[PDB]
């Protein structure tokens, strides 16, 4: 068996001590594969209307864009839940861009 | 007393005892009691996401792919110094690559 490697835009399920969480992958395949790590933002089903939330529209959740985190995806057993729509990735990025710059 | 509030570019100390470069704006850090940070280390191992922090005596390295949201107000945070504007830009520029933020 060959392992699933996170890619840009992937929605993933990741595990921590002690709980499992969805996250959106911001870094590209090359990086994620080489380092066994990735940049991502955490998701929840609870939308409270914070300025940095981005709606993730599924059948019938919110990504917290200010909550960027480097995670070792390989070691945490990341699995693929789905993929965000290009407009949703563009948006998460657009907000991260705010907290920071370019 | 008025607590120290991290501003973009500041070099802080946070316990868990680690230095970090604060990438997010002051309005944000102050409102949310959190900030986006990159961790700093003593020895540069040669990785491409390293950014040297040039001290008047000795130097240090900011690990730019290791962005993390940290609760400063909660973990406690103190100011060591401020990074050079070009040090701040390069760190962001490298993040901009790992992401593609527009």
């Amino acid at each position: 068996v060959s392992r699933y490697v996170p890619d840009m835009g992937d929605l993933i399920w990741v595990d921590f001590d002690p709980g499992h969480r969805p996250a959106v992958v911001l870094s590209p395949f090359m990086y994620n594969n080489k380092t066994g790590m990735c940049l991502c933002v955490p998701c929840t089903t609870q939308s409270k209307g914070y300025p940095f939330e981005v709606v993730l529209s599924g059948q019938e959740g919110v990504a917290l864009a200010d909550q960027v985190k480097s995670i070792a995806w390989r070691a945490r057993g990341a699995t693929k839940k789905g993929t965000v729509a290009p407009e949703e990735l563009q948006l998460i990025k657009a907000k991260i861009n705010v907290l920071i710059g370019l | 007393v008025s607590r120290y509030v991290p501003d973009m570019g500041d070099l802080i100390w946070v316990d868990f005892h680690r230095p970090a470069v604060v990438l997010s704006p002051f309005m944000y850090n102050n409102k949310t009691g959190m900030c986006l940070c990159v961790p700093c280390t003593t020895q540069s191992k040669g990785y491409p996401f390293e950014v040297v922090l040039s001290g008047q005596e000795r130097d240090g390295v900011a690990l730019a792919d290791q962005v993390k949201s940290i609760a400063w107000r909660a973990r406690g945070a103190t100011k060591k110094g401020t990074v050079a504007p070009e040090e701040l830009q390069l760190i962001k520029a490298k993040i901009n690559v790992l992401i593609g933020l527009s």
Partner: peptide, 15 residues
């Protein structure tokens, strides 16, 4: 904001 936690640092995560 509510700070999300991943628990104990894993692998190459330095923190």
């Amino acid at each position: 904001h509510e700070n999300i936690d991943w628990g104990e640092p894993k692998d190459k995560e330095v923190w």
